[PDB]
Paper text:
We then used our 7 Å map for iterative MR-SAD phasing to successively locate the selenium atoms in the X-ray diffraction data, which resulted in the final electron density map to 3.1 Å resolution. During the process of refinement with full non-crystallographic symmetry (NCS), we observed that a small domain of chain D was out of density (2mFo-DFc), which was confirmed by inspecting negatively (−3 σ) and positively (+3 σ) contoured mFo-DFc maps. We determined that enforcing full NCS except for constraints on residues 1363–1506 (RBD-B) produced optimal refinement of the model (see Section 4 and Figure S3). An examination of XptA2 crystal packing revealed that RBD-B of chain D is packed against RBD-A of chain E of another molecule. A direct comparison of the X-ray and cryo-EM structures revealed that the break in the five-fold symmetry of RBD-B of the X-ray structure results in this domain being pushed slightly inwards toward the shell due to the lattice packing. One difference between the two XptA2 structures observed was a slight shift in the positioning of RBD-B (residue Ala1310–Lys1591) in chain D. When compared to the cryo-EM structure enforced by 5-fold symmetry, RBD-B on the X-ray structure exhibits a slight indentation with respect to the outer shell. This subtle difference between the position of RBD-B on all chains is likely due to lattice packing during crystal formation. It allows visualization of certain degrees of flexibility in the domain. This dynamic movement indicates a “pop-socket” interaction between RBD-B and the XptA2 scaffold. We observed Arg2190 from each protomer orients to create a ring of five inward-facing arginine residues at the second narrowest point (2.7 Å) in the channel; the transmembrane region at the tip of the channel creates the narrowest point (1.5 Å). Unknown density was measured in the center of the arginine ring, apparently coordinated by the positively charged amine groups of the five arginine residues. We expect the density corresponds to a counter ion in the crystallization buffer because we do not measure density at this position in the cryo-EM structure.
Author numbering:
A (entry chain C): 1319 to 1562
B (entry chain B): 1514 to 2001
C (entry chain B): 1 to 147
D (entry chain D), G (entry chain C): 2148 to 2245
E (entry chain B): 977 to 1367
F (entry chain C): 1124 to 1220
H (entry chain C): 977 to 1025
I (entry chain A): 1807 to 1854
The structure:
């Protein structure tokens, strides 16, 4: 039986390569036993193609300041992001706020000038420097995809700041590039092994198998593909409603 | 007047004084020299992969010092080798898979896709040209197992100056040394995960089992218990990873062993149970796979388009690309391109530039097939609008605008010229400078394996090179759409 | 049957104290390579180095094309939904800045396919068709061309 | 119909090969035995070549006649355009006449 | 020129250099450097002499999509050419294209369901050269195909798809016995060799006894892709000898190897076993034939049979762990090392275009591996010196 | 063929039936021993053929009936394949005495 | 396709000759022997004559259609030249009219 | 558009909704409902457009 | 000699200029002939 694929919530994650390669039958005495062998599927963090895919997953994929990981943390991200203004349309600061570590991760595609000073500015106006609520310089001036250590719990301030500005100078104002925010979404990337389950129904009986008990080998905990393979699922099919 | 040969370290010289059979007539016309049989002791040749060179030089110099004639040549000496581990043999599993084995490596020889196409063809051809059919699994190549490996993000501190990695196989056959098994490149943003097949036979694994380790240069994790060790357990009748963690006692190929340490280099190593690999678009059957799933639908699309059967043509091109997605099991599929090798960007030609062939280049980088298919869809939309435009009715004109607007929305906003005004005009000798050409090629060669950017920015005044040019076919699409919308 | 590292060592250095690289032999024909290095290289070694240089030349050409194809601003683009940035693409941009994105319209002198680019290729290869001693040398009959 | 003829010509290749295989088996028995047709396989391979040639000629006629109809339509298009110009030209002459 | 005609500085420079290149390459101006004039740019001068053609070949690497034609491509399968012919009409119904596609699927199944039956490697070792295969159709019809692969491309057991070659059908009426058909290369062209079994009886015997007659057939691929009329030889005595008069319960096996050094084809007939002893004398399980360049044959005696004993490692064997058949590819034979039988040096031009060396070659090159030292002998090495300038 | 899943109370719609299609593959069955069968997901035709043969090298020449089982399948383009053949003479004589 | 048909017709000559040689061998044995087809070689030579004629006819048709296409192009060129002269003539009439 | 081109209220409404449907099905506007876009009307959009 | 010339003439009659040059270069080429990566000493590539 080939299960196929499915798209997760908010176009943030995908489920791939689900199938049951072998299904056997056994009619001993007067009860029928069905065995599903090597049932498997894979979960992977991947958007089906939009701003959410390219730049929000890559922001989470960045290594934290405390050292790597960042997987299993809670995030708040923009529902839809668009380019608004600035000197040029760079990759555009795509900011993601890490709730559990109070981080801000921004991602770009290109930078305008290496010599010119660049930092982050989050402001609910765009053209007003003195209305900002966040500002972090780049650790090397020539770098994209960094994390900035807010330091406190400033989720409310972050939700106030639309217009993520990556130009961020005071040689005048010098907005190199800025992006919109639209809505905001709350997501938790932590997965519980008891919540990764295969469930089957044979008439009145219900069998449930989770990753805690019936998993052969647990996959590596990461943002990339995590293939789960289960032990043989033994199903008591003796209460089936046989119509015709 | 001498003939000289070189066989490895030894050098033999034969001159006209000693080794001439008969000297030719002394004249300004043809002077043919014929030598006695030249006996060469070829016992110090450097045999690399059972082949060694023999250098032969004919030289004749006048007392002036002028070279009257010099010819250099190299002879290839091939060593016969019929050792059983170096002989190709063919086996056929009971599942129907044929593979050819040369030592450790096994290569699939046939395909079993035809039988599974019969049931799909019982329904319409809509069922044959799907992603599911292109992901159908193949039976394994004889006895063995599949192992899953995960490698870290690129780390210059741990890995080194370059991001490449090599995976080697260990105790197979009789060789205890490292043999190359897989190669690839580390990613700077995420991890890389792979699934390799390790062959097995009775008595094929040596002490403690097989090794699979990863090397990076500046480190090579093949010390004691650093590579992944696998063995076949005769009791459980399954393959077991020996060193998934530290173990004060564990079973191996040679009985119990004492100090087991976890593998190093890999983030995670495990055994894929009951795993069958999907068909490979780079195998010996790649040509027939590509024709079935890409080349044939595009040919039918083009022929129907040439005969103005627009609706039927759309059905065929949607088997490979559809901007609105693909309905599978009553849901929009997650993949963008319905043709699997395009979605995965599978290269299947290693030498595209050996001859002038546009298809060979596209086979090396199937990205160009994405663009070619995309432009074909733009051609259909514009032709649809042009024919509707010519019907002159209000409904026809509204239809024409719809097609043109949809074409413009797929293209997006056409970009401006960015590099022309910043370009410093060089001299003719400056652009043809060998030093400029060599410096750029040095960076390209380094980039092809590493990515070292010490003193990153290349000091813009350090450029006399030319810039990439936009595709004139795409700018013509935008030019056409602008003119059509203006007239409407 | 040879090792390119050893053969490059047998010719090293390239008169500038550096390990003579494969890119430095772009550049000259097989006859030139055999003639200039007639002492250090055998016929087989000259063939091996010439063949390896051409394959390096082709691979570098392909790598540049792979980067430019995905960096093209024209493909953004509903086709951009199925375009991914390679790790080598980011390394190229860190080194060359905005070069990968500095596309020019056809008909511009800065294009690599412009008549100026064709003139550069003609001058590069036809420059050495005669020795500097000959009055038929390109830079002797027309000294203005070089400037 | 020409396309059908080409398909039918190729449809006899499998039968021709099978006949040569069948006729290689001896067909007389007893204390005088034999009867195999030695050249049955060679004749079958010669037959499929002839059938291949016939199918190719039928396909060529189909494509040739098809393109003849297409060039015929192209001439009709020029004739239509010429007639359209005649009407437009004569309507301009009417303005001059009045 | 008249003042009326106009140009640009870059266009005039291109025109001037193009004229200079033509004069230099065509020996119109003396002292042209012959080494420089052989650069790859000047070899391709037929397309580099014009701005239009030079731009075409340079843009192909960067924008191949501008030249891709969905109806023609280098490497298009014969079955794809057939599909194009079936939809070359001007009225294409939806059902017409479906029917043409179903015909294509019929061809696809025939080629896809092929199974390899034998292989030959055209070298004395498995490091370089081409490996040739013969395939068999699943359908109950004696149809056989062939292809080859270049394994010198191999790196760590992985093979690029372009190293493989299309399956090509053999049209020569082959009816082999069991699976005794294999390819072989000698006289530098592909040959097909197989055995056929027919039922014959001895004439003039009151108890009429029928027996199986085994015939060895050999045909070669001609220049235009057609196959020649096969040579035939009777090998009934050898077949009964090596099978102990039990060809039905044993597996008769065929092996063919090209001895290029002596311009001969070595054919071996043997009983499939688990291992093989040396050839000749006490071992009656292996028989041999020698086929010469003109089609004649010489049945092998014990003296010549022992000469090719080490070829037993290329024979088919039976696996010890379960009775699984493991076919092995035959290899080209050489004594101990393979060295080319000749080498032509060619010619060279002397200093100042004053002298030339002509007709340099070594007609004969032999090898000798006695004890553990290899001896190579160059026979009748010759060259000519003459006073002459190259025109 | 006919689709009998359409059946309601023993009544069958006409469109549930399929056109008669001619078989062009040179079938010469013995008596009425020919039937269709489906395996490998495609239609197969299986039948037996009877030929008159004699055993070689026997002074009293005894003729016997040879029974051959043939199996062919329908291909993608509607043509029929070359049939597989097997000898079933021993089985036929045993069950028919 | 017509060129392919001619080649396929010629491709059966070698097989036809081989069939005639094969069928000259007697095929029945015992105390009744023989079975050679005496005229097998003569029939084979008659067959290659027929295939030669068929191949010639296919080749002639290929060249005949090819030259018909060439003369058709020559007529198109004259039509193009006439139309070009028409435009030049009318542009001169515009000078006269103004 | 110029003032010269004319239309009707129903015709313009049809043209506008057709433009919106094309933008939604072709992933040009975000947050498009993937469940609604699989209705029989939008699957047959090749003839319903 | 005769076959390469025949191919040259037929390609020339069909205006396939580049392909015709390849065939006529088998007998004569004013720019010489490349043998073993060097310009051959002979003027005409056709031996007779």
């Amino acid at each position: 039986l080939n299960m196929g694929s499915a798209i997760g919530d908010d176009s943030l994650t995908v489920m791939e390569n689900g199938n049951i390669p072998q299904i056997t039958s056994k009619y001993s005495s007067d009860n029928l036993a069905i065995t599903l062998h090597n049932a498997a599927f894979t979960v992977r963090y991947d958007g089906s193609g939009n701003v959410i895919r390219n730049k929000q997953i890559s922001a989470m994929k960045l290594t934290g300041v405390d050292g790597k990981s960042q997987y299993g943390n809670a995030f708040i991200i923009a529902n839809t992001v668009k380019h608004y203004g600035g000197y040029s349309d760079l990759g555009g600061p795509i900011t993601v706020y890490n709730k559990t570590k109070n981080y801000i991760a921004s991602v770009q595609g290109h930078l305008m000038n290496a010599d010119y000073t660049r930092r982050l500015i989050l402001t609910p106006v765009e053209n007003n420097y003195y209305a900002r609520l966040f500002e972090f310089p780049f650790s090397p001036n020539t770098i994209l995809n960094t994390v900035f250590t807010v330091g406190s719990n400033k989720t409310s301030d972050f939700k106030k700041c639309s217009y993520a500005v990556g130009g961020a100078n005071s040689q005048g104002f010098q907005i190199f590039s800025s992006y919109q925010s639209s809505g905001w979404l709350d997501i938790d990337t932590g997965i519980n092994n008891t919540d990764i389950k295969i469930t089957v129904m044979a008439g009145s009986k219900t069998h449930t198998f989770t990753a805690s008990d019936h998993i052969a080998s647990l996959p590596a905990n990461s943002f990339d593909a995590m293939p789960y393979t289960f032990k043989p699922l033994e199903i008591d099919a003796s209460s089936l409603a046989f119509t015709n | 007047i001498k003939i000289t040969v070189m066989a490895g370290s030894k050098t033999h010289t034969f001159t006209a004084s000693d080794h001439i059979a008969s000297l030719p007539a002394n004249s300004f016309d043809a002077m043919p020299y014929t030598f006695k049989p030249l006996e060469i002791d070829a016992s110090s040749l450097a045999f690399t992969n059972n082949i060694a060179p023999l250098d032969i030089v004919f030289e004749t110099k006048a007392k002036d010092g002028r070279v009257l004639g010099k010819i250099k040549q190299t002879l290839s000496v091939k060593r016969v080798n019929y050792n059983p581990e170096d002989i190709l043999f063919l086996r056929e599993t009971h599942s129907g898979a044929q593979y050819m084995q040369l030592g450790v490596y096994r290569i699939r020889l046939n395909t079993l896709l035809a039988s599974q196409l019969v049931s799909r063809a019982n329904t319409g051809i809509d069922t044959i040209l799907t992603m599911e059919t292109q992901r159908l699994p193949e039976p394994p190549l004889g006895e063995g197992f599949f192992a899953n490996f995960v490698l870290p993000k690129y780390d210059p501190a741990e890995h080194g100056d370059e991001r490449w990695f090599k995976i080697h196989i260990g105790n197979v056959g009789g060789n205890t040394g490292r043999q190359p098994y897989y190669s690839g490149m580390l990613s700077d943003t995420s991890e890389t995960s792979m699934t390799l097949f390790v062959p097995y036979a009775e008595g094929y694994y040596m002490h403690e089992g097989v090794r699979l380790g990863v090397g990076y240069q500046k480190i090579t994790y093949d010390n004691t218990w650093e590579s992944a060790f696998f063995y076949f357990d005769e009791t459980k009748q399954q393959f077991v990873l020996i060193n998934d963690a530290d173990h004060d006692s564990g079973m191996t190929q040679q009985g119990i062993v004492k100090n087991i340490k976890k593998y190093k280099g890999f983030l995670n190593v495990s055994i894929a149970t009951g795993y069958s690999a999907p068909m490979d678009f780079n195998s010996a059957s790649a040509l027939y796979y590509w024709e079935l799933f890409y080349y044939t639908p595009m040919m039918c699309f083009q022929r129907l388009l040439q005969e103005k059967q627009f609706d039927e043509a759309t059905q065929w091109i949607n088997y490979v690309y559809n901007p609105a997605g693909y309905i599978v099991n009553g849901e929009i599929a997650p993949w963008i391109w319905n043709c699997r090798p395009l979605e995965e960007t599978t290269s299947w030609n290693a030498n595209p530039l050996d001859a002038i062939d546009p298809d060979a280049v596209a086979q090396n980088d199937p990205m160009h097939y994405k663009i070619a298919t995309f432009m074909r869809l733009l051609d259909q939309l514009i032709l649809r609008g042009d024919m509707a435009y010519r019907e002159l009715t209000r409904d026809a004109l509204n239809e024409a605008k719809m097609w043109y607007v949809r074409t413009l929305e797929l293209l997006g906003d056409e970009p401006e010229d960015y590099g022309s005004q910043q370009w410093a005009a060089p001299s003719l000798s400056g652009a043809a400078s060998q030093t400029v050409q060599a410096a750029y090629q040095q960076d390209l060669t380094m980039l092809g394996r590493g990515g070292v950017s010490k003193n990153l920015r290349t000091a813009n005044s350090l450029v006399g090179l030319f810039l990439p040019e936009y595709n004139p076919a795409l700018t013509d699409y935008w030019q056409t759409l602008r003119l059509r919308l203006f007239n409407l | 049957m040879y090792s390119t590292a050893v053969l490059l060592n047998k010719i090293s250095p390239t008169r500038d104290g550096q390990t003579m690289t494969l890119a430095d032999l772009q550049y000259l024909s097989f006859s030139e390579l055999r003639k200039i290095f007639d002492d250090q290289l055998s016929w087989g070694e000259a063939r091996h180095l010439y063949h390896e240089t051409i394959e390096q030349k082709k691979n570098n050409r392909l790598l540049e094309a792979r980067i430019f194809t995905r960096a093209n601003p024209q493909l953004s683009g509903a086709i951009r939904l199925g375009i991914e940035r390679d790790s080598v693409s980011r390394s190229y941009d860190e080194m060359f800045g905005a070069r990968s994105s500095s596309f020019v319209k056809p008909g511009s002198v800065a294009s690599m396919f412009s008549p100026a680019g064709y003139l550069t290729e003609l001058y590069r290869e036809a420059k050495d068709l005669h020795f500097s001693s000959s009055a038929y040398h390109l830079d002797n009959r027309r000294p203005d061309l070089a400037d | 119909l020409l396309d059908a003829a080409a398909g039918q010509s190729l449809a006899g290749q499998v039968l021709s090969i099978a006949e040569g295989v069948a006729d290689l088996v001896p067909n007389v028995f007893g204390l005088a035995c034999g009867g195999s047709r030695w050249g049955a396989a060679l004749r079958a391979s010669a037959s499929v070549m002839s059938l291949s040639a016939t199918a190719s000629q039928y396909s060529a006629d189909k494509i040739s006649r098809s393109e003849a109809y297409r060039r015929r339509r192209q001439e009709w298009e020029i004739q239509r355009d010429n007639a359209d110009g005649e009407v437009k030209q004569m309507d301009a002459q009417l303005e001059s006449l009045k | 020129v008249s003042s009326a005609i106009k140009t640009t500085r870059l266009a005039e420079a291109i025109a001037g250099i193009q004229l200079y290149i033509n004069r230099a390459l065509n020996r119109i101006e003396p002292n042209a450097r012959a080494d420089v004039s052989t650069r790859q740019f000047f070899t391709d001068w037929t397309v580099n002499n014009r701005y239009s053609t030079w731009g075409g070949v340079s843009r192909l690497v960067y924008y191949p999509e501008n030249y891709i034609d969905p109806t023609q491509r280098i490497g298009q399968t014969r079955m794809m050419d057939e599909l194009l012919e079936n939809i070359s009409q001007s009225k294409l119904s939806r059902d017409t294209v479906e029917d043409a596609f179903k015909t294509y699927l019929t061809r696809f199944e025939t080629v896809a369901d092929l199974k390899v039956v034998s292989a030959y490697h055209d070298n004395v070792n498995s490091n370089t050269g081409l490996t040739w295969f013969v395939g068999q159709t699943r359908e109950n019809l004696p149809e056989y195909y062939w292809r080859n692969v270049d394994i010198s491309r191999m790196q760590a057991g992985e093979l690029a798809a372009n190293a493989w070659k299309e399956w090509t059908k053999i049209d020569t009426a082959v009816n082999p016995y069991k699976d005794a058909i294999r390819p072989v290369i000698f006289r530098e062209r592909l040959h097909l060799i197989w055995v056929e079994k027919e039922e014959v009886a001895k004439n003039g015997t009151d108890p009429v006894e029928t027996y199986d007659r085994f015939t060895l057939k050999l045909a070669f691929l001609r220049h235009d892709g057609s196959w020649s009329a096969p040579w035939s030889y009777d090998i009934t005595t050898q077949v009964e000898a090596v099978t102990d008069k039990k060809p039905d319960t044993e597996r008769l096996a065929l092996a063919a190897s090209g001895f290029q050094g002596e311009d001969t084809l070595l054919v071996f007939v043997y009983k499939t076993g688990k291992s093989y002893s040396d050839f000749g004398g006490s071992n009656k399980n292996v028989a041999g034939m020698t086929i010469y360049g003109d089609g004649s044959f010489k049945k092998m005696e014990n003296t010549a049979l022992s000469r090719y004993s080490q070829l037993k490692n290329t024979f088919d064997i039976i696996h010890t762990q379960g009775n699984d058949l493991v076919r092995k590819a035959s290899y080209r034979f050489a004594q101990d090392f393979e060295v080319p039988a000749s080498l032509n040096m060619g010619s060279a031009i002397g200093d100042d275009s004053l002298t030339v060396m002509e007709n340099g070659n070594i007609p004969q090159i032999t090898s000798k591996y006695s004890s553990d030292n290899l001896a190579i002998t160059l026979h009748n090495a010759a060259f000519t010196v003459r006073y002459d300038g190259s025109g």
